[PDB]
Amino acid sequence: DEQPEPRTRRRAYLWCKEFLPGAWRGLREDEFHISVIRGGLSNMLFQCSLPDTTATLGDEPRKVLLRLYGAEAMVLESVMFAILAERSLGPKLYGIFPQGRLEQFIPSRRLDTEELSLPDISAEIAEKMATFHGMKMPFNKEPKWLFGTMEKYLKEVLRIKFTEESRIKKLHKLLSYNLPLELENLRSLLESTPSPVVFCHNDCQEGNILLLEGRENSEKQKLMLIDFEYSSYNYRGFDIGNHFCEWMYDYSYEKYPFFRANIRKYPTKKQQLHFISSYLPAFQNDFENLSTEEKSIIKEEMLLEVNRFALASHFLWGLWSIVQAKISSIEFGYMDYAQARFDAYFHQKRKLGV
Amino acid sequence: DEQPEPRTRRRAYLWCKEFLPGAWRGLREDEFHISVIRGGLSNMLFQCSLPDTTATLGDEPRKVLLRLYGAEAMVLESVMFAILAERSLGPKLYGIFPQGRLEQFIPSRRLDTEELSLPDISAEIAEKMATFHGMKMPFNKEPKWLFGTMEKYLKEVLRIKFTEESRIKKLHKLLSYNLPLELENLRSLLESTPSPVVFCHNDCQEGNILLLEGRENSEKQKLMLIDFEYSSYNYRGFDIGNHFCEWMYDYSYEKYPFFRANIRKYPTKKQQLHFISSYLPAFQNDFENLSTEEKSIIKEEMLLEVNRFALASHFLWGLWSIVQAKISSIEFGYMDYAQARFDAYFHQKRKLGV
Numbered sequence: 001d002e003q004p005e006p007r008t009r010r011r012a013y014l015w016c017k018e019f020l021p022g023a024w025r026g027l028r029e030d031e032f033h034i035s036v037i038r039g040g041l042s043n044m045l046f047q048c049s050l051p052d053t054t055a056t057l058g059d060e061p062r063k064v065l066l067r068l069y070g071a072e073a074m075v076l077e078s079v080m081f082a083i084l085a086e087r088s089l090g091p092k093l094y095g096i097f098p099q100g101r102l103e104q105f106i107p108s109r110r111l112d113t114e115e116l117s118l119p120d121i122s123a124e125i126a127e128k129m130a131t132f133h134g135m136k137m138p139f140n141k142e143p144k145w146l147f148g149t150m151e152k153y154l155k156e157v158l159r160i161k162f163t164e165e166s167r168i169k170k171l172h173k174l175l176s177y178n179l180p181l182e183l184e185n186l187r188s189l190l191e192s193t194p195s196p197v198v199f200c201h202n203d204c205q206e207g208n209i210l211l212l213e214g215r216e217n218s219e220k221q222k223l224m225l226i227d228f229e230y231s232s233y234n235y236r237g238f239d240i241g242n243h244f245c246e247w248m249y250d251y252s253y254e255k256y257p258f259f260r261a262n263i264r265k266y267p268t269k270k271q272q273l274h275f276i277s278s279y280l281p282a283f284q285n286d287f288e289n290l291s292t293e294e295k296s297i298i299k300e301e302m303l304l305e306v307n308r309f310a311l312a313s314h315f316l317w318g319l320w321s322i323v324q325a326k327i328s329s330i331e332f333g334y335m336d337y338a339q340a341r342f343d344a345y346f347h348q349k350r351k352l353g354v
Numbered sequence: 355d356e357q358p359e360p361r362t363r364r365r366a367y368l369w370c371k372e373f374l375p376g377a378w379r380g381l382r383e384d385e386f387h388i389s390v391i392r393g394g395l396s397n398m399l400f401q402c403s404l405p406d407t408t409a410t411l412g413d414e415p416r417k418v419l420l421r422l423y424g425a426e427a428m429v430l431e432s433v434m435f436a437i438l439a440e441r442s443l444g445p446k447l448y449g450i451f452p453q454g455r456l457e458q459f460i461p462s463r464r465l466d467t468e469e470l471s472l473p474d475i476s477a478e479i480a481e482k483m484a485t486f487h488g489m490k491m492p493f494n495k496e497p498k499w500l501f502g503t504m505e506k507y508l509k510e511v512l513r514i515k516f517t518e519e520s521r522i523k524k525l526h527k528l529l530s531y532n533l534p535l536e537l538e539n540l541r542s543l544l545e546s547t548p549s550p551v552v553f554c555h556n557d558c559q560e561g562n563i564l565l566l567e568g569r570e571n572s573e574k575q576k577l578m579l580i581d582f583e584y585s586s587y588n589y590r591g592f593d594i595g596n597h598f599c600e601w602m603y604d605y606s607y608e609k610y611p612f613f614r615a616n617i618r619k620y621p622t623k624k625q626q627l628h629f630i631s632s633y634l635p636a637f638q639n640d641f642e643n644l645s646t647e648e649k650s651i652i653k654e655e656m657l658l659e660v661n662r663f664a665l666a667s668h669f670l671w672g673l674w675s676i677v678q679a680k681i682s683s684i685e686f687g688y689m690d691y692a693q694a695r696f697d698a699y700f701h702q703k704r705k706l707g708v
């Protein structure tokens with residue numbers, strides 16, 4: 001596909017030749033194949049490969065994925081990526097340098113929103129998240145990510161002024177909900193809602209779940225979670241409730257605001273039980289050996305836990321989205337998205353009687 | 355042993371309680387045990403433990419090693435440490451944060467210089483280095499580390515002016531060798547000395563080799579290489595030749611200049627053959643099957659390779675040491691050490707007839 005500018009082709013050639021082994025070490029300028037996967041100012045993706053006629057010398061890859069940043073956290077994320085790679089929970093790490101990195105190229109596609117509700121898919125997503133939740137990572141285990149982040153973003157939101165008329169409007173409506181009071185109502189609800197602290201993805205939407213090419217008939221091993229840039233030790237209820245929220249949001253819409261929201265698409269109780277029934281035995285591990293009574297009590301408690309934490313997904317991503325409306329160049333209806341999440345927050349409160 | 359200053363105890367307590375699981379999460383400041391392993395302005399080491407009376411809740415460690423920095427590379431080094439950890443080639447990585455890290459505590463001691471020449475030890479060092487040399491790492495494979503670094507350091511050396519009499523004296527004697535011309539003579543010699551590029555430790559001295567406690571009966575599994583701060587893709591000959599040079603230097607001397615040098619302690623040909631005879635079958639892996647004459651040709655040429663690259667160990671650490679004499683406050687005769695390495699450089703040249 002249509003090439004990057006010559007500037008980056010050169011740098012991409014150098015990075016591949018120097019960081020990759022076998023036939024890559026002796027590739028010349030004229031033999032280098034690169035095409036753009038995703039452009040933009042930040043987090044660009046290119047596919048890079050050897051000529052179809054060059055043979056590999058050993059077990060080096062024929063095709064790799066280059067990721068470039070654009071514009072502390074960067075050390076943590078790299079270490080995280082490298083660990084996942086070592087454990088076979090993520091794409092392999094082939095090179096790491098200031099401007100970005102070289103990763104394994106996984107033939108696949110992203111899931112669509114409508115696929116999240118398919119029983120086989122939903123069950124596997126549950127299995128993988130549980131596995132994720134169960135591993136050790138060399139990061140801070142005090143759960144300050146969630147309210148630390150909402151407070152930070154809220155503070156910034158109170159400070160924003162917009163220059164354009166309609167954004168000033170939309171902002172005025174959102175501020176009229178009294179966000180600082182509403183945040184303390186949330187804290188109180190969640191502080192009396194026990195949830196184990198675990199290693200969370202925190203952004204487990206369909207764009208971050210790959211359907212692996214050639215495994216489409218596997219029932220339980222056709223997927224992989226990617227993109228852990230928001231990962232942290234956090235309440236388990238947030239990770240699961242955030243995922244459920246994402247059943248309602250489709251970002252493949254091609255016209256402004258470049259998403260659709262549908263409250264009726266939140267998972268039914270039946271559907272939520274199917275997800276947590278798959279999660280628990282994969283997360284607790286002698287869960288199956290409990291009495292039907294005990295299991296049912298745990299499930300019922302977990303349903304309260306996750307639907308309450310779901311409120312924090314709306315509230316966090318609502319605030320985040322307001323800030324993005326000021327500072328991002330990406331074409332997306334950030335303010336309308338914010339209003340959508342806040343509508344769902346208040347609908348969900350009403351559902352719960354909270 | 356030794357107690358650190360109060361701010362450190364406090365910060366150390368917090369890092370342990372927040373990053374470590376099980377009984378660490380619920381420890382009070384008055385139950386925290388910490389003693390100093392090594393002080394100074396940079397790279398301090400503390401042992402941290404639970405009370406002898408507290409029980410563990412699960413598989414968390416009772417004792418850990420904290421390392422603090424003090425004064426790109428930092429990303430690479432962390433990713434490197436985390437990979438080694440995942441592969442069981444280094445201590446486990448328990449937490450990582452801007453000020454330093456938490457590592458597994460390996461009961462052990464460092465080897466002494468005189469132990470490097472013990473047959474069992476020398477053979478095992480060879481086996482481990484070869485294993486090291488054979489692994490894949492997500493770092494630059496173009497071998498620019500060695501002369502890139504010497505050039506950098508040389509340039510700084512030509513710029514240094516000292517105020518203290520005896521350092522000015524030592525500096526003038528070292529500059530009188532014409533170091534820029536001598537560097538180009540080294541480049542020419544090494545450009546015509548073939549050596550495979552491999553993942554090198556670059557600092558494989560006795561301070562960086564642990565004798566593992568309880569395995570002192572084991573003939574081949576009682577050691578571990580540590581401290582890969584200087585690691586990079588580099589010529590194999592450097593790694594081995596740098597190791598052989600370190601047979602000549604004892605850093606346990608307790609009076610100024612705080613090392614001793616003994617040229618007669620460099621390994622004999624017999625001793626070098628013992629080392630490479632252990633290395634080769636561990637690095638090539640179908641080496642034993644070759645005809646006695648092919649093996650003998652490979653060994654003889656490897657002896658040439660490593661003794662020529664040994665010159666680059668002297669020259670690099672010589673220059674590095676001159677620069678440390680300006681900018682480090684560590685009590686060490688950096689200038690005398692520089693002169694010792696350069697004496698050995700010229701004695702070695704003479705040995706070779708180069």
Ligand SMILES: c1ccc(CN[n+]2cnn(Cc3ccccc3)c2)cc1
Pocket residue numbers: 203251317330332337
């Ligand atoms: C492109 C398209 C939509 C958006 C916002 N929409 N949104 C919903 N969830 N999240 C978390 C999330 C955060 C950052 C990036 C993706 C998801 C963000 C940003 C950029």
Ligand SMILES: c1ccc(CN[n+]2cnn(Cc3ccccc3)c2)cc1
Pocket residue numbers: 042043203207208227229251
């Ligand atoms: C919409 C949004 C995100 C995704 C995948 N998820 N994801 C997580 N982080 N990023 C970076 C990133 C996100 C948005 C734009 C550039 C870089 C992307 C799929 C569909």
Ligand SMILES: c1ccc(CN[n+]2cnn(Cc3ccccc3)c2)cc1
Pocket residue numbers: 557559561605671686691
């Ligand atoms: C203990 C051991 C060796 C030395 C000096 N000399 N010297 C030459 N190479 N190296 C490795 C090295 C490099 C940087 C810092 C320490 C070691 C050290 C001082 C104290």
